[PDB]
């Protein structure tokens, strides 16, 4: 009887937090077990802060943003919002809110205030590990990457402008450390990866020949692989860095082309999707595991990433499916 309003993973992928009309609940992603539930009226988009006791959610009743402390069972603060909230992010330092046509940044902790003037953007943004990335307001295939300086005059700040795509950016995904950004356009034809320091292009991958829209992207725990789901409804896995290049070794003949490399997924899986579910989200359970969450079905599919050592080839397997509930 309870529809899922919003759902997200905590930063390290260990938990799933969802809001219903009657409540919000927190699940352990794998193995999948409900960790806790809390009755709440009209909870909107909802986010989590690591495994800590703070949880954010946007009132679907009002323009309010509730910051909820689970130890004492109350709002430490409520924050007035000027528009609809498209996206939301938390760190022990900042609170980042994408609302309507702008991005607002608030201090986490007293006095929970706005420490810089709202940032106008083109609809697409992501914040992880102190690093902010967003679509440009005018050119929609360009992105800005900038660090948030907590101690500085002058928390703005600096920033880099990358022309990521020809067509406008569909979505954006930071890896865990935050040094790479995976990048996507409306085409969904090819996926790019940029270094966050300079915004220089690291790698380019081809998803397919035909245009599609891309539902999700997520980086492996060790930052070596990137998982992607399109609306063609196939899961793709790309290897961005093999072991040596990931560990920053010295590569003996790296210059040749050597290698002239990859460009395509090492893995696909064609997903069977009921006519209902039009969106989902991806989590890495481990360096070889994955989970897909489907809001409509309240369903979690567990996938196994296999490697054949002798043939140097990979394949995907679906291990399990579990209702939420």
Q: CB of 86 within 8 A of CB of 100? A: yes
Give CA–CA dist 7/22, Å, rounded.
14
Give CA–CA dist 253/250, Å, rounded.
9
Q: Which residues contact 44 (CB under 8 A, 6 or more apart)?
A: 5, 6, 19, 57, 58, 59, 60, 85
Q: CB of 117 within 8 A of CB of 134? A: no
Strands (E), 175-255: 180-185, 190-195, 201-206, 214-219, 225-230, 234-239
Query: How does DSSP classify residue 179?
Result: S
- This structure was determined by X-ray
Residue 273 β-bridge partners: none
């Amino acid at each position: 009887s309870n529809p899922i309003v919003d759902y997200e993973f905590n930063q390290d992928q260990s938990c799933l937090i969802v809001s219903t009309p009657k409540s919000f609940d927190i699940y352990n992603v794998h193995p999948l077990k409900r960790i806790m539930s809390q009755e709440m009226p009209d909870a909107g988009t909802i986010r989590m802060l690591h495994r800590t006791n703070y949880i954010a959610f946007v009132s679907t009743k009002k323009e309010l943003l509730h910051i909820w402390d689970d130890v004492k069972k109350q709002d430490i603060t409520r924050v007035k919002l000027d528009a609809a909230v498209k996206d939301l992010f938390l760190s022990r330092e900042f609170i980042v809110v994408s609302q309507g046509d702008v991005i607002s940044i608030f201090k986490f902790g007293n006095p929970w205030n706005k420490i810089t003037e709202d940032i106008k953007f083109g609809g697409v943004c992501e914040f992880a590990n102190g690093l902010l990335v967003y679509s440009n307001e005018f050119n929609l295939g360009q992105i800005h990457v900038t660090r948030l300086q907590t101690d500085a005059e002058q928390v703005v700040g600096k920033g880099v402008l990358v022309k990521a795509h020809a067509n406008p950016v569909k979505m954006v995904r930071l890896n865990r450390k935050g040094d790479m950004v995976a990048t996507c356009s409306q085409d969904g034809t090819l996926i790019r990866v940029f270094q966050t320091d300079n915004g220089v292009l690291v790698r380019e991958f081809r998803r397919g020949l035909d245009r599609t829209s891309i539902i999700d992207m997520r980086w492996s725990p060790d930052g070596s692989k990137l998982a992607v789901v399109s609306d063609k409804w196939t899961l793709h896995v790309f290897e961005v860095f093999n072991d040596a290049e990931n560990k920053r070794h010295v590569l003996k003949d790296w210059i040749n082309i050597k290698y002239f490399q990859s460009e395509w997924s090492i893995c696909n899986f064609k997903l069977k999707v009921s006519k209902g579910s039009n969106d989902c989200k991806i989590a890495w359970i481990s360096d070889t595991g994955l989970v897909i969450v489907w809001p409509n079905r309240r369903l979690a599919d567990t996938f196994k990433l296999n490697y054949n050592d002798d043939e140097h080839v990979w394949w995907l397997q679906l291990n399990q499916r579990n209702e939420i509930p």
